[PDB]
Amino acid sequence: ESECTLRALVEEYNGACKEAPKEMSKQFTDYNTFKRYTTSKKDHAPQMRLVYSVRKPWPISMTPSKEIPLVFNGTKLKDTILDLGESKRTRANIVVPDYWSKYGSQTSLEVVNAILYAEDLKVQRFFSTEWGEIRYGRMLPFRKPVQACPTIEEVNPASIPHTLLQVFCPQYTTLDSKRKAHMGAVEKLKRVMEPICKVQTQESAVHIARSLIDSNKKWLPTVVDHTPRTAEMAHFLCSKYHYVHTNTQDLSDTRSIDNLCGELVKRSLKCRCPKETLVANLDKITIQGRPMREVLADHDGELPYLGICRVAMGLSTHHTMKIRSTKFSILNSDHPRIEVKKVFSLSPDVQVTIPYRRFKGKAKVYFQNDQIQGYFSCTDRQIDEIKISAPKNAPLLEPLLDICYYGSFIEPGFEQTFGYPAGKREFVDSFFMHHSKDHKAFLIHMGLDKDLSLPLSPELNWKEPALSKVCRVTELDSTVQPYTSATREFVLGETLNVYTQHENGLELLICPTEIRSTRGPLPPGTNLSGSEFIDIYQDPFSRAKSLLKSTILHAERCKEFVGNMLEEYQDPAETTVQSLVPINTWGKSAKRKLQEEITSDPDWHQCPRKRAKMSYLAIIAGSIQDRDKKQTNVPRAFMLRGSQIEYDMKATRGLVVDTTNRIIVGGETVLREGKGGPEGYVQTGVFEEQPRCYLVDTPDHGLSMGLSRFCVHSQGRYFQYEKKISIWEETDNIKATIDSQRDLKRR
Amino acid sequence: TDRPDHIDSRVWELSETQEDWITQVHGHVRRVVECWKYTICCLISNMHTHRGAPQYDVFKWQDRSTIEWICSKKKVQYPERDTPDLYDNERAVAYKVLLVSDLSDHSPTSGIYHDLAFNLEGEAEESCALVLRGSQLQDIKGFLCRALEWVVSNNLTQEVVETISGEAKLQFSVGTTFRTLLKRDTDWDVIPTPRVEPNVPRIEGRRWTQMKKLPLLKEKEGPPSPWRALLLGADSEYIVCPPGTDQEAISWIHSQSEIECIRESKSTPASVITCLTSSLQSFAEGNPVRSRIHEDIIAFGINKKQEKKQSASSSASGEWKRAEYQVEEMSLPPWVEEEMVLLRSDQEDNWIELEKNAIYTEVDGVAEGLVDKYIEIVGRTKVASVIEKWQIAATRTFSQLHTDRSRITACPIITRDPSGNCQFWGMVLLGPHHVKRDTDNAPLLIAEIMGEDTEEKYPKHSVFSLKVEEKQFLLSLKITSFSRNKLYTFSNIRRVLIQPASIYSQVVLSRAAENNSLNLEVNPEIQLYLEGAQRGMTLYQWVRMILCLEFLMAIYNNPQMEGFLANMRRLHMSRHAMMERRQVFLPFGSRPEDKVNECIINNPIVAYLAKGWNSMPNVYY
Amino acid sequence: MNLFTPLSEINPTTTQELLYAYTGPAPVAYGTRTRAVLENIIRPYQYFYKEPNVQRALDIKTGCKEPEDINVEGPSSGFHTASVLKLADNFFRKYRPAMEKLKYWILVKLPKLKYAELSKGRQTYSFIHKRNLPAPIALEETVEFLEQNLRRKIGPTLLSYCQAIADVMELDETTYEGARTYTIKFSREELWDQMRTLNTMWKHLERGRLNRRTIATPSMLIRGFVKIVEDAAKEILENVPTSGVPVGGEEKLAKLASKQTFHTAVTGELSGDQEKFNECLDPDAMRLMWTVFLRKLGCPDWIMELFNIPFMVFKSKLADMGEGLVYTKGKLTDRKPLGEMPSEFDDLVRNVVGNSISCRLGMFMGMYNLTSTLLALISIEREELTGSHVESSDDFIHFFNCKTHEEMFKQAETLRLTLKLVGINMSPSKCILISPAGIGEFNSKFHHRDFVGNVATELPALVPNGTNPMTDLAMGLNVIKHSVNTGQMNLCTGALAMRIFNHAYKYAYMALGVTRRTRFMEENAITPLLTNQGASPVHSFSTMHLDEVALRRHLGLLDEETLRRILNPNNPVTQKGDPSMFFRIENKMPQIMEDYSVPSCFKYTLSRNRHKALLNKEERYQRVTSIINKLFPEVLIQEASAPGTVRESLKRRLELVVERSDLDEERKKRILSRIF
RNA sequence: UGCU
């Protein structure tokens, strides 16, 4: 029973105290030092003894057990003649495991399933991949770090220990540790290790879970546009002579996170000084229950908007400069790619300044597109050499023209017009179309030669024979691949431009206003209630729910919202409010009701029911009114625009329901009368002895009961969280102080 | 990064240039404490307003120009050395945030500003508590408790306490006598301060020459090298015994064996044939380990050390001098080419029976087909049978090792053809082996069937005549001592097949990849310098003789072979460069051939490789 | 060798695999190391002057030589002080991010370094037992020595350990008390000599060299000091383009490929080695380079002193001579010390200190691979050199992009001279330059169009490991898989290696032919069903990564009834001697302690068939660690931080576990009653 | 006492 474990622990503690009178006078923190003292497990050349060791009379050492017969069918399975130690001393014949393969006690099938869980996952993963057709061919390897094995959930390295602590020993954690843990991974890991922990020891299960949520990237030679997303199958699907075609999609939420980040960046560029707006909004948005900073840290993707948001949070980005379908990486350059504000005065009133980027000094850029791989060297706007490793007879139109656009080498466009300039995208499209139908600028820029050794044909094809050949274009003699030695650190511009710190300045890496990507689904569980952009939601129900959660749960936001709606001032949620209420004629009555409710009760912004009534009145007040219709009295309830959802002033039904016990907004209990934590908790105390208040079992256990004071245990210390009485968080008070300092500095 | 989680990113980046943290004791902890103080300052002025202006004005981490500008407007002046952290509009007086280890017995530090003292547990002193509101106290206590949790989690309690106290040790220091000990063997002190101005002088160098012609390896002069290897190699044969176990085969051999000496060597006396006969008789009964006899002392060199030392002591005369060990130089023997030619002879069996792996995918089928092709093109060859004999002999000699035996152990070398018949290559006799290390030698009596006898090739072998079933055979019967490590290495000799398989696989797969289709039956033409002239030659026979040369190289691996092969890689690369119209340039005193020639002493296969290098052209146009 | 030089299908670079005699025996060393040790001692003195004058070189403390004294036609021992200063300044001015990372490491990472990192080493010379001992044993005995001589406790950090080492040096007499009981005495001079003593010893089983070399090991009194400088050097080297030592495997190949850009008219590629490395490098040059790095970083004095301790200790090194030079009268063999009778090392008699010999020049040992790499890299930074350089320790490759051949030759000679300025001599017979680049070698990696795979560098790992059938099969198959992934072995070689490994692995466990195991299985009607039992292989080329048991279960080759027996967690074969603790996810009692066995019955333990007090102390430490792990599940995921000593910490933890056990109050009382 |  449960008492046997306590008995065993007590006897172990007593024996360790008696058998080791010293080794406990040391501090507990000395464990990190003396856990490594495990000598006498060392051995030398076990492989040079295996043949003899197996062929010894008694090779196997096991504990004394009665399940192994002394003699079975004339063979002596075990030997107890010597018994020098008599404990872990009896020796067994080499055939004992073979004997046990039969004639042995069995185990439940659940145990067998639990033991082979990860190996079975690997086997089904192998037998579930489509074994395609082998495509033999010469291949130029690309050495990159790739994930060793797939993970059930990707978590940033800082949050792995807290996730494991929440999975295995929640009773010895604090609320900060719980907040830093990935709760989705916690649930997945708990479900996975429920049967596994019954057959694996503590450390074995801990590190099995760690491996299930650890990336563990390793460098391997891969094939471009054939990345198997994991090195589990590289020996089968890849080599220097073949690949096996496979059809596997991403099945990852990185695309949705890109969509969310793109919406945030696009809406942030429309305000004043977008950088701090984006930073503040990223600190107020939560996907599922995880803060946006942590989920950005979790997903280290190649995508542009994800990279911009990761840089805004101080993290790194792996994004590479991409033109159409060709990726460019600067091997080394004298100066960063500069930009020229080429103004076009084609018309006096109609003039557009279209800026392009070029090189100054010498530079060497690696390019990759499909199977085409190589590098080129340039000086200023002149190409010196190009080396390409491409399959024979391949058309090199698009990669070469992407190179020309990247370096601004050919000069029909950029500084010129080849026709009136209007917008960046139109000019780029015209450039590409013009050079697609007229690709002679490359030939007049590079020159022609009659040598047959040069592989680039005048029609921009690889190894096709022709009378003339394109000069200074040769085959890639040696493998070339980008590699950065120093840890690149990125700089985010005030206009949300991602820069890389080059020696002589700043190198542009990601630049919005030309990142073309259509809108996509948002990540599930996204919470925009605390952010300034609720209109990102495309669903009226979600918009209304987020707006009402913002107003109800916080008094100051309700104050600001009511004030802006009543006085027609600019509000962050003007678009949402205008899109929620149909075109009506209740604005004047709503503003009136606001006036009498404010005058009658100056102390209204403390009862959530009053906040709900004021929010309803303000939402109607800030609605889009109709001109050619006389104003009417505000109704008790109205219907959301383009929907059958009812919003009610009395909050008896529909979108908001305020029962005596609790308030429900959009089917979710936002506020509970006595058991809730809307204002949060603060730590308030670390002690080595239990304080004078209740000790909860786990941090989440104390978060549900909602006591005024409770403690948690974590490595011999007690943390007694009580309550938050301040009406502001640390982040925005720090923001206010920093802005006040900088707004005294400006004079 | 290095930012603590509880520290805000803006505060962390603002603190980077405020103080030079590298020179301060516990610079990281000092920066963290300053960040704590600035965060406390931020929390004190938590969006408080007064007369349409912030209640508190924060001086901390602000440029001195603005500080003086706003202090002048407030009719207050503070000295440069100590400046208050913040100023309160209500109850007008300057405040400074202080962190103290003990809240008790604390007095104001300066008479120009007030002190807002806090302890590491978040508590505040009485005047600070009454000045500030309850919300500010709770915020400060919560932030300080989060900081304390971070401190105790990272085991930084002592560093934080020392930083808060104000005084701490330099975290490292060197005393006086230790400094004197250190400065004993150097002309500079602990932190050297040479008086010379930095400069990179110009030094007259030399000129880089060009390797216009490839180096010529030195061919040593001396007697031809004897066959110095554990077993016979290409001159190995076997007797086709009737099917049965090892005991039956040994009984059948011994019961019908007529042994007569035809050539006796001084190294191996002909009288130790009785040792082999006794071992055969004992193994034919079922007792592989037998007792010692009189001629076992001669056969296994029992106690030879004592008589050698006694003879040395009796003959000891003269003066002590240094060792000056010498290695006799030997020339390339004629039998190396014969060994290469004879090792390629075809056989009637495959001699490579490796169980096939499973086949699930098409890649698996391709790999197994390639392996089967390689096995069938190198299997039916004498070298494969010799490799099998070496494997069996080495493993059966190594398995009876690891013990301290004072008796004699017999280790037969028997293989079985795919018809049940036993094939008796020979027998290895293991003598008294009180082995303790991995390099100490174990005495052996290697007796095995010989195909052809040669005095110059086998000077230490005593060849006997074996008469079994109206057939005539030969017996080697050499006395050798052989170490544990070498026996273990030769127990895994089957790995030698990988490199010729590597060459074959690379050729086939390159042909498949260039034309984008697998063939698996290609037997192309390989251009090689056979007799000093480039002539075509098929891939299969090339792989066969590559396997033969690799096997001959493996069993003759020694320091000379290791150095030779390590130092020929540079010359191989230089030749490959020269064959592609590339020039090779060398430093002033560059003689890459000397580091190869120093490794050419007496190894017959090293000499064979050197002659092969010399024969092929050295100048490329 | 003509058979290894194809001309039509493949190139000799691909056949460089054939220039390997591996799978043959590796050479070993037999007798006295005294001659080799004395040769390594005398070589630095022979190279200081252009004309070898050993007697005039033994009185030199700091090896600093004028630029006109630097030998250009041979090895040159010593450095130019002004050259070192200027080149270190140039290397600091460039690669500013590397210096920023160095400052980050000094401020953040260095204080968190623990002296338990010293336990990761192999056999270490012990100044107490005058022998070679495993690193944990030597570290623990050194910690006890410091604790009982300084009368205080040593902090877990490495800085505290180094400070304790420095503090003990200030004492006049030090003593060591240890269980057998026995007491040994150290003076300041004796303990200083033991601090600066390197234990020399042969290097066995080394391939690729004709002559045997000697390796050395330092004591724990200086390994800690070397650890800081090595970690700082690694931090710097990870952020500089010209380094090649901190990266390895495929990352090193990617870094090399990033520099194989040949676009100018004359594009050379120089690949070579440095001759007489580790003995032409004065530690004072490394001192000066580190001092310049720390001065230009604004570092205080204490860190400079800490960084300079190890190189001075190596300036005062005492190399342990062997058991004597071999002398013969007739056919006798006697071993005599250096100074007994004349030899070729008579000039070094004055440096004899007991059985050890001093050497103020050179390093004598590769204890500063990263620092020597930094010293090599600082010399590269100069205006004349415009190519790409990669240096690991003493193997380097250089890529030239020059307009004319004469300019390339001038750059190559400038490279040679600037290497010689800091005491690094290019091996003339080992450095080869190809004027059109495209063919080269670095760390035995040959590239012509791409880095070609090198078979026979993976053959030594193809032998079964000898632990148990499951572990052996798993690790052999995964080694083969890694070789396939890295390009060393292709489809055919991979499958052939699989077959050879499988056949040897089945032989080693008595699964082929008629053996005792096979006979027992046959007479008792036990079908194998497993690879180690003689069954047909289940693993294929594409299934190298799959576990045997899971794959057999999936394919139906292993039925569930036998699975219920093989994977029994209660089998006697792999039963543990003590109970183990188990987690219980979402349970009233989250920890249950019970007897356990390794699930697989074929993961048995093979008996091995044959400072004792320190071993019992290790066992006591293991017991304390086991009880701490049982009572503190959270130290398995994060570092231990509970306050107080071990006894009180576990006492309160055991209590708190009891009051949450959900039992009766009086039962909790009776459980607490018997807690010591 | 049995590896092609």
Numbering used by the authors:
A (entry chain C): 8 to 426, 428 to 755
B (entry chain A): 2 to 622
C (entry chain B): 1 to 180, 209 to 638, 645 to 710
Quote the passages of the study that discuss this structure, keeping the authors' original sentences.
Thogotoviruses, exemplified by Thogoto virus (THOV), are capable of infecting humans using ticks as vectors. Numbered by size, segments 1, 2 and 3 encode the PB2, PB1 and PA subunits respectively to constitute the THOV polymerase. Here, we report a series of THOV polymerase cryo-EM structures with resolutions from 2.3 to 3.2 Å to reveal the initiation and elongation processes of THOV RNA synthesis.
A replicative elongation sample was prepared using the non-capped dinucleotide primer pppApG. Cryo-EM imaging of the sample identified an asymmetric polymerase dimer structure (THOVPol-ELR-THOVPol-RER) and a monomeric product receiving polymerase structure (THOVPol-RER). The asymmetric dimer structure determined from the replicative elongation sample closely resembles that determined from the transcriptional elongation sample. THOVPol-ELR and THOVPol-RER within the asymmetric dimer show high similarity in peripheral domain configuration and RNA binding, compared with equivalent structures obtained from the transcriptional elongation sample. Therefore, we show that, starting from capped or non-capped dinucleotide, RNA synthesis induces highly similar THOVPol conformations. Without structural restraints posed by the primer tethered cap-binding domain as in FluPol, RNA elongation alone, starting from capped or non-capped short primers, is found to trigger re-configuration of the peripheral domains to allow the formation of the THOVPol elongation-reception asymmetric dimer without host factor involvement.
